[PDB]
Design an enzyme around this catalytic site. Structure first.
Site, short mmCIF file in Angstrom:
data_model
loop_
_atom_site.label_atom_id
_atom_site.label_comp_id
_atom_site.label_asym_id
_atom_site.label_seq_id
_atom_site.Cartn_x
_atom_site.Cartn_y
_atom_site.Cartn_z
N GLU A 1 -62.49 -83.46 64.71
CA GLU A 1 -61.18 -82.83 64.64
C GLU A 1 -60.39 -83.35 63.45
OE1 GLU A 1 -59.29 -80.31 65.89
OE2 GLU A 1 -61.42 -79.90 66.21
N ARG A 2 -59.59 -82.46 62.88
CA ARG A 2 -58.50 -82.88 62.00
C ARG A 2 -57.62 -83.85 62.76
NH1 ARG A 2 -59.87 -77.57 60.50
NH2 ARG A 2 -58.83 -76.79 58.61
N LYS B 1 -59.17 -70.78 65.90
CA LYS B 1 -59.86 -71.35 67.05
C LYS B 1 -59.14 -72.55 67.65
CE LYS B 1 -63.79 -71.53 65.20
NZ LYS B 1 -65.25 -71.79 65.16
N1 LIG Z 1 -52.63 -67.49 67.04
C1 LIG Z 1 -52.16 -67.61 65.78
N2 LIG Z 1 -50.93 -67.16 65.45
C2 LIG Z 1 -50.46 -67.27 64.20
N3 LIG Z 1 -51.14 -67.83 63.19
C3 LIG Z 1 -52.39 -68.32 63.37
C4 LIG Z 1 -52.98 -68.23 64.71
N4 LIG Z 1 -54.20 -68.78 64.64
C5 LIG Z 1 -54.37 -69.18 63.36
N5 LIG Z 1 -53.30 -68.91 62.61
C6 LIG Z 1 -53.19 -69.24 61.17
O1 LIG Z 1 -54.36 -69.97 60.82
C7 LIG Z 1 -54.06 -71.29 60.33
C8 LIG Z 1 -54.80 -72.35 61.14
O2 LIG Z 1 -56.19 -72.09 61.05
P1 LIG Z 1 -56.89 -71.36 62.29
O3 LIG Z 1 -56.19 -71.74 63.56
O4 LIG Z 1 -56.98 -69.91 61.92
O5 LIG Z 1 -58.40 -71.88 62.36
P2 LIG Z 1 -58.66 -73.31 63.00
O6 LIG Z 1 -58.50 -73.16 64.49
O7 LIG Z 1 -57.83 -74.31 62.24
O8 LIG Z 1 -60.21 -73.51 62.67
P3 LIG Z 1 -60.79 -74.94 62.27
O9 LIG Z 1 -60.02 -75.92 63.11
O10 LIG Z 1 -62.25 -74.85 62.64
O11 LIG Z 1 -60.52 -75.05 60.79
C9 LIG Z 1 -52.56 -71.47 60.42
O12 LIG Z 1 -52.06 -71.69 59.10
C10 LIG Z 1 -52.01 -70.17 60.96
O13 LIG Z 1 -51.10 -69.59 60.01
#
Ligand SMILES: Nc1ncnc2c1ncn2[C@@H]1O[C@H](COP(=O)(O)OP(=O)(O)OP(=O)(O)O)[C@@H](O)[C@H]1O
Ligand SMILES: Nc1ncnc2c1ncn2[C@@H]1O[C@H](COP(=O)(O)OP(=O)(O)OP(=O)(O)O)[C@@H](O)[C@H]1O
Ligand SMILES: Nc1ncnc2c1ncn2[C@@H]1O[C@H](COP(=O)(O)OP(=O)(O)O)[C@@H](O)[C@H]1O
Lengths: 479, 501, 51, 478, 145
Positions: free
Chosen positions: D188-189, D162
């Site tokens: 946010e992180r 996301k």
């Molecule tokens: N569009 C993408 N392409 C490649 N890898 C992705 C993608 N989106 C997420 N990832 C993988 O997911 C990890 C990051 O978490 P992700 O983006 O899935 O959730 P998030 O947006 O961090 O959710 P939240 O911030 O709520 O935890 C990264 O390590 C990456 O490897």
């Protein structure tokens, strides 16, 4: 005096105070009166369950919380609530407190039985077991009722229970020459109104001349408070009680719904300073059902046959109110969302529905073999249908492949039309005789009519009409 | 116009004022926290009185103890001093009502949130006027129209009957609600789209669609901003109910659209929880059953003794993950007149509307729809239920019987009849046309995927050639042999026209 | 022989697919039952200790 | 200037402050507390009232760390609601929950400020146009069109893609259309907040020198913050956005992520406020606070405040109320199913619930409407066949159902949009597609032009001609 | 042993001490990272810390929420996992990479505590018991890691 104040009103819970001269007993009717929003002489009746110290008491009200304001007078009747009962109290639709809600002239209120009474002990209970036929096919086959027993409609999410009540009332009210009483216990008001219209139509109420109506209408609203719905079943039960001891006739009860009663009791008990219980309900559920199903007992003095609809929420059985309602029932009919989804009506799960009066020696030792054979092949079909849905009937081996089609015909054949459900179906229904039922089923389970199409059994009263519809279907297959 | 004329009306309003001897109950407010006002004193306060504050953010007194009174903040009182003289108003949540509401976006405190101007109004209708009586009312014997094909066909609505639209979210529920509103264009049907607890951009979109359709000339939209206090956010359906009582009590049958009711239950839950009223199951207060009972029971059909109007209700209830075994979709199905489901599977699978008759049901029946369609296809609901089972059964399709082959292709073409385009409200005569086209098996030999084209060609052909059918049957409500003959005639002609080509 | 060998590998994959699907559904059931009855217990003790 | 006095109680983050009996402060207004510290007695303890609780005492919520201060501290009522700096002073400045610039730059000029919250905008001040702009991500542009000026919801659990999707969306619309573009970080992180800050610095949308030319007000609120701080940063960012739509009168981009942390802060502060709980854990007022933070996002008559909000669906529970209020409260639901990310598509978006009311013929063209239809029909059919194909294998279907499964998986792996910011994460430099591709790749898939190239031959490539070239390359390498 | 400072309280310890222990580990790690050096903190196991805090909260009678864990636990873990970063040369560019060991139960990654700590970290690192009993040691499932 006994005039006290109402200290706290929270919902339909009324914390009434009293001077230390008098603090009345439980279950006693109190009536705040003379006041409304319009300056009206509007009264509200309220009975007591818990009395929380300092000569004060928390009451539940059988009418709406609007009107009455804290610091008002209360007039306890020095007694528990008493319901006007009698043959004059037939015919008219009236309230939980007994007020005739038919808006014409009130019934003669001179014989009032107290609404909370003792339950008859089993030394008074008529231990005479008996068989009842009500003309609806799957019931008089597989869940045969006791003429004297307690009869339950374990219904699903509004499927076939109330229309089944209307059909069964239409079929047996004329049959039973003794008195009858319909209890509207938190029923939908317009469907109870439709029932009242059908009683006016079929002349069971005899609108032109009353008190010869062997049926007696009493109803409590959904929109009424749970204080009203917590005792409207007791009102109907006491009318049937009066007819079961004083009149001591054959009495028929059709309360709907008992789960409305349960929900109202749970509802108000959450408010009146009491803990919750397991999912749904109050901790007093078992004693509520105890009071009811110990007072609706066919007595050695006078018989009674109380039928009742049970709406389980979420359409299950592990729910605690049907977990005790089954324990307090003797003729249980359990409807199914699946058989309603396939249009089969009454959508009874015949696996689930049984009866104590399905003994071989009490139904006939051929009728019992009929019932066991149909339950066997049906249960095996319900066992098989999951594997069917993944591997194909045409794969599923022949010694069960004849049985799946057989029971598939069976359930739709025991779907039979009702004289009131014709508005929902298209064809006017049929009052089926149990000999015709066991005959048609002795055809099907044996496998004599395995040549017939399955939809020839669809929604048919007689097996002869099923053969006729089969010839019609073959005729339209050619045409 | 400035400082010129209104001084005479100023003198009229001043001279001739009350100077009343009105003794009032007045309370020193003790405990305001988070939308509630546990107020000290204030003895003779009726539970349900509006209580006037220092501010003007009035409030209903729901609960009341021996010391405090549980009072909510209809209108969030963002600055209320402790010990403020918070007196009640005496009257009980009364609602002004008039026919001049017909179009104005109105707030739950009867206030025009349209921008059209304030409304003169005479009566002051209660917020908890009870249901009409048991004996006083008639069965739902008279039809009411949806404009959508499948609900009218299998699971009809009647004037006074309270069908419950239900389903998961984002599946067209508000869409079919507005469609069955703006179907009513000549049926003398007041619609009350009570919008509850959703996007004001969405309610602006639906009033934009109403202004475009012209249907906002007679309908009354009770909006609810999601920013509104939860007391107002649950109060508004009661205001809509009393406002529809205003028109049903004359003679005028009306329709109401609660939208939704789950947000009503949630807002009422929030108020009951902040009031420290203990919750029942699923963390809700127990009496959301009682709340929706008092709501929906105020919606029924009058009889000739009091005006024979009706208040057919459509409370949409939101259920997550297609569940029924959630608490409020368990209460409202018990206290409604049957329910219709909008499955995400059937919506995204093309059936739009998505009322699968396997779970959807109308529990008052064909007496609430027209006799012509009755005599045509009363049986078609159960026929489609069997077709749905057998088509689930026709997964095992290796050597199907010829009779069940005819049955499955029949109900297949029937299900294809029950598809209709976006916001195309068919004439009820046209619904009779397509339902007879289905039940008489003309389409059985025809093309199975061109049935929509067959239907639009057929309806254009009859609406051009033989519109006398539509008027004679809408004047008789009865499927006679003249209707039969005109139908089969145009069926032969347009079947030829679409065979070639 | 090839027919009842293709049936045999059909069942030899269907049994294992049913087994792993059973495993996923068992984990789903354990989590769902856990979540439902914890919500039940937490709700009823909230109502009980709310006095 | 106003009522001074003493805090009477402190309960962790939440504080109960007594006052002179004459005048108590407002509800929802702010007030600082001086208190104490190690070195100096700073006004770092800002505070905000929540509940006047008897005995001339308010029960209030804090905004900073609540250690070191005690009851009986010299509380200062500022009387007004919490002011916050607005204007061009925001532009580029990475400021904090009370508005102070924590970007290690100068204290921004207080000549233009605004209170923290306000009433809902008007029934008439809602706009009328169903505005639509594309992004560049083909699954969105196919089956979830974005109501610009409305609300754009990003759902999903954790580890489903996301914030990465938000980074890609802001990577497009930072130099695409839209005027001032306020990001807010709710929970946010903070390392990823500064990561996207450095991405805006490197991409140059914010401005190193002369920062007042940025059209970006990155007002983050870090996840480390106290619950009152997380409970207010969303209102800060929305105050910036409404200030710009009322004074800049601008089409304002309102990236926020993720407001589940906002309402979770509301829950954990209510649990110390003593408000009774609600469904499974949360505050009873989650509906009303979400109603505030949504109803104060609208497209005005002049400012189309387009908000791209995320919601952390906890443990992938759509039944949960923190979804169950928001995806009523917004327009473009975009749920990101975890199992698609387990399979390996990025972004991992199902089509069945990711939807909008913008998917309408009279908005997107009936052609694009039926395009999205003919996608969604096939994929819903693929799901209702998926749950019975996984048990008992592939070839038990018909020829038609087998072809439909193949074409539905074609659409699915064809929607694997390579992301321009995900090159540093995976390796593939992402691609950009538009409406011509949005119609044409669908057209080739559903017509059967591309009907023999394998499932990898449209995998992780947006453009269908790029998929054809990839098919040529993989057919060449044999 | 020169590279580490082992922080060890066990299951005998009261849940309050097991609660505040990784906070103390992060505090001394903040002192060491803060003094210009790289450092690495090994929370093991963070799910046990969640259980300890949940016990501490229920003995504090605070009404728990999701999966009977308090809603505080996300901010709580955010505290001791957001104190772990790499500074810049403004302050001495120390770094505090962290390995919070978090045990999911039966692979239910959609359980409250594991999805919570995934929602605060910089990504997942998988370890399936199936790959561990499949001889592949270590058992990192690289398709989801
Ligand atoms: N569009 C993408 N392409 C490649 N890898 C992705 C993608 N989106 C997420 N990832 C993988 O997911 C990890 C990051 O978490 P992700 O983006 O899935 O959730 P998030 O947006 O961090 O959710 P939240 O911030 O709520 O935890 C990264 O390590 C990456 O490897
Ligand atoms: N007959 C139809 N044909 C095509 N699309 C339809 C039809 N009926 C409804 N829809 C679509 O359903 C979509 C969702 O509408 P709607 O908002 O009413 O769903 P909902 O479940 O009520 O969502 P919410 O409850 O959030 O309002 C609309 O965008 C509309 O295009
Ligand atoms: N197969 C069926 N046969 C008869 N009625 C049916 C059938 N399926 C649905 N119904 C509807 O169900 C309604 C009765 O449901 P029931 O459970 O008896 O009452 P309620 O819905 O009030 O609980 C009828 O009014 C009818 O319209």
């Amino acid at each position: 005096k006994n005039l006290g104040r109402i200290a706290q009103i929270i919902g339909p819970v009324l914390d009434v105070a009293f001077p230390p001269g008098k603090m009345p007993n439980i279950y006693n009717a109190l009536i705040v009166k003379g006041r409304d929003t319009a300056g009206q002489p509007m009264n509200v009746t309220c009975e007591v369950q818990q009395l929380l110290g300092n000569n004060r008491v928390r009451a539940v009200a059988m009418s709406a919380t609007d009107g009455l304001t804290r610091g008002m007078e209360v007039i306890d009747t020095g007694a528990p609530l008493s319901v006007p009962v009698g043959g004059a109290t037939l015919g008219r639709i009236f309230n939980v407190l007994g007020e005739p809600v038919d808006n014409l002239g009130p019934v003669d209120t001179r014989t009032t039985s107290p609404i909370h009474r003792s339950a008859p002990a089993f030394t008074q209970l008529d231990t005479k077991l008996s068989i009842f036929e009500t003309g609806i096919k799957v019931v008089d086959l597989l869940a045969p009722y006791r003429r004297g027993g307690k009869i339950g409609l374990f219904g699903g999410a509004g499927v076939g229970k109330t229309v089944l009540i209307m059909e069964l009332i239409n079929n047996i009210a004329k049959a039973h020459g003794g008195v009858s009483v319909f209890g509207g216990v938190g029923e939908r008001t317009r469907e109870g109104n439709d029932l009242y219209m059908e009683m006016k139509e079929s002349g069971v109420i005899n609108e032109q001349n009353i008190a010869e109506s062997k049926v007696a209408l009493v109803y409590g609203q959904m929109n009424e408070p749970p204080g009203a719905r917590m005792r409207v079943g007791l009102t109907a039960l006491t009318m049937a009680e009066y007819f079961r001891d004083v009149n001591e006739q054959d009495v028929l009860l059709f309360i709907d719904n008992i789960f409305r009663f349960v929900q109202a009791g749970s509802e108000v008990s959450a408010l009146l300073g009491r803990m919750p219980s397991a999912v749904g309900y109050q901790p007093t559920l078992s004693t509520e059902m105890g009071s009811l199903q110990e007072r609706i007992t066919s007595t050695k003095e006078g018989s009674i046959t109380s039928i009742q609809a049970v709406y389980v929420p979420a359409d299950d059985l592990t729910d605690p109110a049907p977990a005790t309602t089954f324990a307090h029932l003797d003729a249980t009919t359990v409807l199914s969302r699946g058989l309603a989804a396939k249009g089969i009506y009454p959508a009874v799960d015949p696996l689930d529905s049984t009866s104590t009066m399905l003994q071989p020696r009490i139904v006939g030792e051929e009728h019992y073999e009929i019932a066991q054979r149909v339950k066997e092949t049906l249960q095996r079909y319900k066992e098989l249908q999951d594997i069917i849905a993944i591997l194909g009937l045409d794969e599923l081996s022949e010694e069960d492949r004849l049985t799946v089609a057989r029971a598939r015909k069976i359930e739709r054949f025991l779907s039979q039309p009702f004289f009131v459900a014709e508005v929902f179906t298209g064809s006017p229904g049929k009052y089926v005789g149990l000999a015709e039922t066991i005959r048609g089923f002795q055809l099907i389970l044996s496998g004599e009519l395995d040549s017939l199409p399955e939809q020839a059994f669809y929604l048919v009263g007689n097996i002869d009409e099923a053969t006729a519809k089969a010839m019609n279907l073959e005729m339209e297959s050619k045409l | 116009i400035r400082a010129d004329e209104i001084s005479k009306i100023i003198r009229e309003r001043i001279e001739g004022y009350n100077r009343e001897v009105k003794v009032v109950n007045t309370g020193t407010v003790l405990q305001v926290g988070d939308g509630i006002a546990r107020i000290h004193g204030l003895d003779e306060v009726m539970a349900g009185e509006l209580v006037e504050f220092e501010e003007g953010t009035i409030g209903i007194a729901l609960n009341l103890e021996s010391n405090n009174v549980g009072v909510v903040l209809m209108g969030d009182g963002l600055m209320i001093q402790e010990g403020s003289s918070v007196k009640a108003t005496g009257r009980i949540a009364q609602i002004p009502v008039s026919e001049a509401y017909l179009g104005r976006v109105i707030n739950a405190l009867a206030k025009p949130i349209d921008g059209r101007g304030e409304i003169t109004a005479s009566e002051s209708r209660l917020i908890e006027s009870p249901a009409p009586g048991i004996m006083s009312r008639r069965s739902v014997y008279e039809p009411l129209q949806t404009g959508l094909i499948a609900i009218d066909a299998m699971i009809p609505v009647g004037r006074g009957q309270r069908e419950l639209i239900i389903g998961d979210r984002q599946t067209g529920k508000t869409a079919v609600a507005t469609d069955t509103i703006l179907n009513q264009q000549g049926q003398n049907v007041i619609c009350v789209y009570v919008a509850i607890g959703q996007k004001a951009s969405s309610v602006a979109q639906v009033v934009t669609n109403f202004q475009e359709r012209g249907a906002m000339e007679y309908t009354i939209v009770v909006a609810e901003t999601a920013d509104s206090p939860a007391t107002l956010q649950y109060l508004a359906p009661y205001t809509g109910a009393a406002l529809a009582e205003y028109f049903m009590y004359r003679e005028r049958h009306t329709l109401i659209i609660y939208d939704d009711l789950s947000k009503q239950a949630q807002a009422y839950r929030q108020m009951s929880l902040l009031l420290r009223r203990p919750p029942g199951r699923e963390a809700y207060p127990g009496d959301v059953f009682y709340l929706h009972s008092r709501l929906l029971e105020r919606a029924a059909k009058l009889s000739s003794l009091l005006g024979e109007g009706s208040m057919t209700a459509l409370p949409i209830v939101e259920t997550q993950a297609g569940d029924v075994s959630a608490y409020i979709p368990t209460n409202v199905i018990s206290i409604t007149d049957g329910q219709i489901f909008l499955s995400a599977d059937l919506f995204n699978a093309g059936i739009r509307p998505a009322i699968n008759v396997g779970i959807s049901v109308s529990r008052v029946g064909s007496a609430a729809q027209i006799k012509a369609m009755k005599k045509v296809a009363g049986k078609l609901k159960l026929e489609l239920a069997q077709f749905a089972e057998l088509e689930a059964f026709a997964q095992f399709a290796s050597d199907l019987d010829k009779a069940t082959q005819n049955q499955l292709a029949r109900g297949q073409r029937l299900r294809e009849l029950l598809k209709q385009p976006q916001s195309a409200p068919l004439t009820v005569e046209e619904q009779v046309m397509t339902i007879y086209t289905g039940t008489n098996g003309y389409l059985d030999s025809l093309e199975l995927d061109q049935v929509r084209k067959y239907l639009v060609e057929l309806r254009t052909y009859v609406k051009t050639n033989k519109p006398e059918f539509q008027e004679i049957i809408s004047s008789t409500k009865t499927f006679t042999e003249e209707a039969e003959a005109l139908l089969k005639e145009a069926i032969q002609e347009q079947m030829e026209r679409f065979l070639l080509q | 022989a090839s027919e009842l060998a293709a049936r045999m590998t059909a069942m030899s994959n269907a049994t294992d697919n049913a087994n792993e699907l059973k495993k996923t559904l068992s984990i789903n059931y354990n989590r769902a039952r856990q979540a439902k009855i914890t919500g039940e217990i937490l709700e009823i003790v909230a109502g009980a200790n709310a006095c």
